[PDB]
Amino acid sequence: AFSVNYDSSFGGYSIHDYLGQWASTFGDVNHTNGNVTDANSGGFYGGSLSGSQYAISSTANQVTAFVAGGNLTYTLFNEPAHTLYGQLDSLSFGDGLSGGDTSPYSIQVPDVSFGGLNLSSLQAQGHDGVVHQVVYGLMSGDTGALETALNGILDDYGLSVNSTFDQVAAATA
Numbered sequence: 001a002f003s004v005n006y007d008s009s010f011g012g013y014s015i016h017d018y019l020g021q022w023a024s025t026f027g028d029v030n031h032t033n034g035n036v037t038d039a040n041s042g043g044f045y046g047g048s049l050s051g052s053q054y055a056i057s058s059t060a061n062q063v064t065a066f067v068a069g070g071n072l073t074y075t076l077f078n079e080p081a082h083t084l085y086g087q088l089d090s091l092s093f094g095d096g097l098s099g100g101d102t103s104p105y106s107i108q109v110p111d112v113s114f115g116g117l118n119l120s121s122l123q124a125q126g127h128d129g130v131v132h133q134v135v136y137g138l139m140s141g142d143t144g145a146l147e148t149a150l151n152g153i154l155d156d157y158g159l160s161v162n163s164t165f166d167q168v169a170a171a172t173a
């Protein structure tokens with residue numbers, strides 16, 4: 001039940017092409033040991049350290065953003081420390097993050113969204129869990145874990161992240 005939604009200007013991009021463009025614009029928020037403040041922590045909708053969405057905007061341009069949707073919880077200092085886990089269904093990418101407190105986060109100039117990812121990870125997997133790898137990678141402007149996960153999904157259709165959005169649309173829709 002994987003789905004893709006995209007601005008039609010991306011029809012002829014591969015998934016890999018689009019993610020490379022987004023990652024080059026987003027940069028890296030440097031959410032690392034010695035470097036974490038409110039500026040680069042992002043935030044959850046629905047709670048302080050858990051909720052139905054997690055979102056963050058670029059510290060390089062202040063506008064490029066992603067929103068992850070699902071049921072997500074971050075352990076902060078509980079073991080295994082600094083682990084994001086749960087059920088991740090959707091990822092939306094674009095410019096202009098809005099909302100997040102009394103209403104859900106959304107994106108004002110959206111490019112692409114993936115839904116039906118059905119990725120699931122347990123607290124005890126710590127940093128090797130697929131949800132943590134995907135989202136922490138995106139915060140660091142590294143799309144590798146997401147690309148590996150999407151290849152796992154797309155193999156059922158005989159596609160991969162080198163397929164264009166219009167190719168994926170014809171296969172899943």
Ligand code: HEM
Pocket residue numbers: 031032033034035036041042043049054074082083084132135136
């Ligand atoms: C939900 C998405 C998040 C993920 C995937 C994530 C992941 C991580 C990772 C992997 C580290 C360790 C970096 C290293 O060892 O170099 C870390 C550190 C840290 N994170 Fe997060 N984090 C997230 C959100 C947050 C939030 C919302 C807060 C608090 C508002 C937070 C507070 C911290 C702190 C205080 C540190 C430790 C910095 C230090 O030891 O100097 N993180 N996080």
